[PDB]
Design a protein around this ligand. Structure first.
Ligand SMILES: CN1CCn2nc(Nc3cc(-c4cccc(NC(=O)c5cc6ccccc6s5)c4CO)n[nH]c3=O)cc2C1
Length: 263
């Protein structure tokens, strides 16, 4: 529990699934992001009840959840500030500057974080470039892991809602809501595709339902121009129709390192 008196609000950072987020400082020194949880937007009992485990996830490549303020309303969630914002806009805005080696390093950053979550049997559930953040040195970190579990918004929680991450979801999630490590694996493959396409939208011009139909018929995202064959083999392995044929993040990390070694 963070003492809200130790927080200094400084700047608006926009809005997310739980409402307003601000930039501020903790005890005058540490840059933080502060979510102000819109009333009615979150399953608050469930979150507070299970919030300890989320604070104890600690890894360089995870956006740290520093703590919470729950003695007043709205509740606050206080997290590690990342000066370059979310990965999707960072890709699109710096599109013409990236070398392929840097793209691979971004995939490695994310894969390390997910290997850690995997080892803790903790699911992200909404992995995507929009839910990765980039710090002032260009390091990518995975953000908002596990929070989808607390979203109260039928458009987000229903597989046919307008906000559900259909384009990051494997068949068993779209058909049966079967989340597992292997559905995070699928989403990581799509995230690699976002990185190597420099921030394009997956299945652009397809609706969500057409996307679902597409992928249920075996069809997959094309290889982006900047992805080598080896890289594409790695992201494609994430999209096996059968979940148990998909790799683990440990294997994916080994693959990425192997490609780095070869280069
Ligand atoms: C000039 N730029 C302006 C944008 N800009 N942004 C920066 N940096 C951060 C943004 C956020 C942030 C802000 C608003 C919303 C959200 N996203 C969410 O709240 C949620 C995502 C999800 C996903 C699934 C389930 C529930 C939720 S709730 C975040 C990231 O958490 N945070 N931290 C940061 O450092 C730095 C900049 C400079």
């Amino acid at each position: 529990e963070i003492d809200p008196k130790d927080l200094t609000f400084l700047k608006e950072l926009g809005t997310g699934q739980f409402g307003v987020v601000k930039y501020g400082k903790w005890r005058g020194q540490y840059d933080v992001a502060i979510k102000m949880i819109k009333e009615g937007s979150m399953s608050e009992d469930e979150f507070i009840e299970e919030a300890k485990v989320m604070m104890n996830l600690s890894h360089e490549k995870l956006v740290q959840l520093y703590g919470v303020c729950t003695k007043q309303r709205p509740i606050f969630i206080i997290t590690e500030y990342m000066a370059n914002g979310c990965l999707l806009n960072y890709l699109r805005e710096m599109r013409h500057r990236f070398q392929t080696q840097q793209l691979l390093e971004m995939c490695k950053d994310v894969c390390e974080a997910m290997e850690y979550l995997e080892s803790k049997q903790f699911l992200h559930r909404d992995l995507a470039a929009r839910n990765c953040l980039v710090n002032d040195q260009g390091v990518v970190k995975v953000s908002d892991f596990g929070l989808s579990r607390y979203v109260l918004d039928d458009e987000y929680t229903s597989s046919v809602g307008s906000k559900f991450p259909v384009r990051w979801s494997p068949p068993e999630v779209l058909m049966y809501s079967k989340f597992s490590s292997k559905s995070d694996i699928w989403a990581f493959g799509v995230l690699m595709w976002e990185i190597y396409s420099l921030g394009k939208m997956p299945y652009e011009r397809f609706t969500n339902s057409e996307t679902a139909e597409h992928i249920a018929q075996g069809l997959r995202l094309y290889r982006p121009h900047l992805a080598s064959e080896k890289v594409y083999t790695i992201m494609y392995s994430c999209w096996h129709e059968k979940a148990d044929e998909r790799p683990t993040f440990k294997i994916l990390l080994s693959n990425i390192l192997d490609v780095m070694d070869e280069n």
